[PDB]
Amino acid sequence: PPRPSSGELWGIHLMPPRILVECLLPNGMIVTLECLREATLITIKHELFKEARKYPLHQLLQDESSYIFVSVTQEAEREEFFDETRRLCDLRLFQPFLKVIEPVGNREEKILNREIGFAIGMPVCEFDMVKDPEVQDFRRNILNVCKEAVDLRDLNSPHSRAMYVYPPNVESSPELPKHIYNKLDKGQIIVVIWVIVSPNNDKQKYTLKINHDCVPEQVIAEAIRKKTRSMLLSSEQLKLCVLEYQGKYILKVCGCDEYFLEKYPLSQYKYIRSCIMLGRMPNLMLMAKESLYSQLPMDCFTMPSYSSTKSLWVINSALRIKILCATYVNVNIRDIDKIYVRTGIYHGGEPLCDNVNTQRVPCSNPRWNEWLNYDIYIPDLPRAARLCLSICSVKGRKGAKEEHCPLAWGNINLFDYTDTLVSGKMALNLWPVPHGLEDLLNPIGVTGSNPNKETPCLELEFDWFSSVVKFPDMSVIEEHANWNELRENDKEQLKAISTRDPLSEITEQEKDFLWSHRHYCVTIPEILPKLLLSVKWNSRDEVAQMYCLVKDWPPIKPEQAMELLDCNYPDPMVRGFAVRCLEKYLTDDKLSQYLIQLVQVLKYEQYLDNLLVRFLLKKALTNQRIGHFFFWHLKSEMHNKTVSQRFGLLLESYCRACGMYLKHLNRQVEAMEKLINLTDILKQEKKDETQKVQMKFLVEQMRRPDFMDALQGFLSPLNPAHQLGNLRLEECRIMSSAKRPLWLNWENPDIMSELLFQNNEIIFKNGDDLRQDMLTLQIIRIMENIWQNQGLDLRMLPYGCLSIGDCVGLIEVVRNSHTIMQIQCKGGLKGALQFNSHTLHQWLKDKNKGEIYDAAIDLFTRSCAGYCVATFILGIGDRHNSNIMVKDDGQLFHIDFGHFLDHKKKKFGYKRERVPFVLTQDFLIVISKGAQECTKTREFERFQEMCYKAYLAIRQHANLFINLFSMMLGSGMPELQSFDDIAYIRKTLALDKTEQEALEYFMKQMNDARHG
Amino acid sequence: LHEYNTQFQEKSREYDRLYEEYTRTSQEIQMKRTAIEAFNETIKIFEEQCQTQERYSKEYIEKFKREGNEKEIQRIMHNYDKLKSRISEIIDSRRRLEEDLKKQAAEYREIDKRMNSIKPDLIQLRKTRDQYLMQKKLNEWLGN
């Protein structure tokens, strides 16, 4: 299993500066050797062999070069240490001992498998130990995607790999919303092109004014034009000179590793469009293509070492499953009367027949030996059919009203990955009931046995039909399937039905309605999710007809195909259509934006090898920016034992084929381990020490050589385009919060660091689940994209936040930003820890005095409006001066979104949000430019129109957000366990109402939350 | 409703506390299973070290007896004795953890027993409270 902690030994966070290590020599002798905790294995083996001469049989030992060390790690792994450059404290040994052995196996191959096991957070040798054929099949067969993706990277060497390593970061649309166009000087943008003249870092600039839609070569050619004009070339020689040279240079962003390698218009590149929004002139670096191509290492992808049937439809039998017995259940016989197994045959969340329960048996004797007969004909079983069962306790001690409670649950696919109907006996280790689950069955929970075999084990037995039963091939289903009522009454209803949100109930009539008109549903493709829920999945005839309709279904937008990947649509053909829609329409930009949800929905796939995981692997292996966050999002949830094997097996394959980026990840993974371990100490053993003693301990520790090498020279996991050089240790500090956050500052090693940022500031926080803040900042970013397309310049600030593991992650620091409170702390105290309302505007008046004042108040009021609407729709309460920040430039933004969707108030049954926005007055003063009667201004009226306009815009896209939350159900986030948690968005967006009743509803809630 | 909500909010608080102890105890049990797994692999390595030592000492003890170098034979015996001291010290460490795992794994079953008797009772209290469903006094009676 994975490590319990990040400590350098089992139960010890910090090795002593000197530690005694048991060395077991090959001649049988044992030598205790005092070693530095930071000592390399090279040094330690050398010192051992010096000491070994003092021991008997020392003339039997070969030279120290002929031996390597082996030991036991905290993951219970018997690891051979070939890469002897590693320091002692970073081996993460179980006990401080090393055995001296002759090395066995391939050096480079074993060193790789340790780097992978390190990056995954799980020893690779475990996958070699799983007897499961589906796992071994996944590990082998997935390499097709790896090799195929690697060939596509070496197809157009070296440009193709330059594209892989430094993909263009471009918007999905070259079109500028016209309010962005007018920020340009008649569509032209001024850019400063820099070139470094060797050797003195001599920086020469050529400032250009050019159209916003100029492609990089056109920008380059214009730079060459500016340079060469002074050299009296002939007019034609200049033409020939521009055409030849323009193709051989590239542009790079000053201060970071983002390059303009592709034919996009300059404004389509995200760095340029942002420069238009913020009004900053882009600083770019011109670079010869050979200079970049030399920096690109060759990605070596090596193939690893491990590289009579009856049809389902001929079975004339009903489905029956035998519940044999359970090993044990933890119930007190005095309080629980009896127990039973409750079963159901499900397709997704919908049951295919009546649920069947076993007879009741005594608690102490959980054995049933009972054949359960189900209301489904075996040929009518859909492919994603699943048995959902649980052991339920019943106590009738409250009267004639019995108590039923779930004890432990487990779900199983009735067909394995080989399209075979399950047969014979099977043992299913059950899962504990989730905290708060009162349902007797858990079909949305993971399907499959609990890897923890120390749990209640329920024995099942499936039927046997004298032969292996296989699901029919697609040709048979289609062939079997092949064997003007549409008035406007029906046409208007079909459109109204498709527009209803995914969480609206679809009545049994409407289910019948869409199915009868399934063919006109083709003429309205977005209705496919609604129609799919209307099929009789317990009828192969209707499913077959549905399969044929899907085979020719028009491709739908990506944001609608994602819904067909959540827990509601388990059928492989439905998902297959969904993945094909993504291959066709999902830009690498949008993929990055929805990368979290696409990783989450992997938990609902029936099998390890599927079309979605292959599409995601290929995309990750051909775009390193996608592949980076594909890694961490998979990585950050390896702690979750419900998927750790699936994600572990996947992370193995990505790491084996991602090329040289694995090395950069190893730097990041190890850099984080030092931070986790250090924070563990600060949070645990030194929890009672003062700020000073901890700060001393902090400065003491990072100064240690192992810490210096680990935490310097790596890529920011928040954004790998930022290089983290040396630590600016004077600026590193532990923050006052009791979770002991770590404010870290690095040097920017880019030669143009002074033009972008010479300091990279990151907050490392151990002890808080950041998945909420990740999702909120993701949602905030999408709301801004919508508002911009509809012409609403609401400046949000979705700063970087990345959960990297169990309640541990990173936050991008926003420079020149201060909480409202930090701004308020200027002239003294008012009341019980409270402050003055006018101080905020008074401060902002000083920061942006003169002509910038109107632009700053405008930026504030625009930025304030977006967060007001965003926090309302998402139900993020408790917004006050501590979690609202304002930049010196005037942009307001919210922080710390730990809990949303009204889950703090769910325990009370009172659904009425009336907390007064504490900072209503303070912000009104700014919007009103300092008026005494703030609410009477015309500017305030403009502010209200933005919020009304922004609110309806999001209401117009309610299906997208509902789907995004729906795709997150398997994450185990506390505020997101059922669709009922997601239903709060239905209330805030007033989807049961009309646009007029909704806006009035909004205006009401704002007034209920008005003056604070 | 005041009587039933207070009864509800206590068992709610106790089920939450027990669930914290339950999951916390569960993570600890896994670690003990890990360390026992690591101890087994470590014990296996040391036992090999003893077996290999007897092979090499075999012909040298024979040589050092005949060569009258009794002082060298004590060297080999002293170190071999030092090995067995380490092995016994480590088997004891595994054994104490195995014993420790038994107490926590039994306590673990005891937490899940207490919750699984509180879990159905907690639902019923919601039913009785909800029967009472059909403003200062409403937020007051709900434990505020």
Ligand SMILES: Cc1cc([C@@H](C)Nc2ccccc2C(=O)O)c2[n+](c1)C(=O)CC(N1CCCCC1)=N2
């Ligand atoms: C200037 C200002 C004014 C308001 C409120 C008081 N008024 C409005 C705001 C928009 C549109 C109409 C009105 C109106 O009352 O007609 C406000 N905010 C700033 C916020 O920043 C956050 C916030 N809430 C509300 C509750 C959920 C958190 C966010 N409300």
Ligand SMILES: Cc1nc(NC(=O)N2CCC[C@H]2C(N)=O)sc1-c1ccnc(C(C)(C)C(F)(F)F)c1
């Ligand atoms: C994006 C961001 N930017 C910041 N800026 C400074 O802290 N600044 C900005 C400049 C100086 C310094 C300050 N004195 O004030 S804080 C921050 C942030 C956003 C969201 N969550 C956090 C937490 C919850 C992890 C925190 F702070 F509690 F750890 C921090």
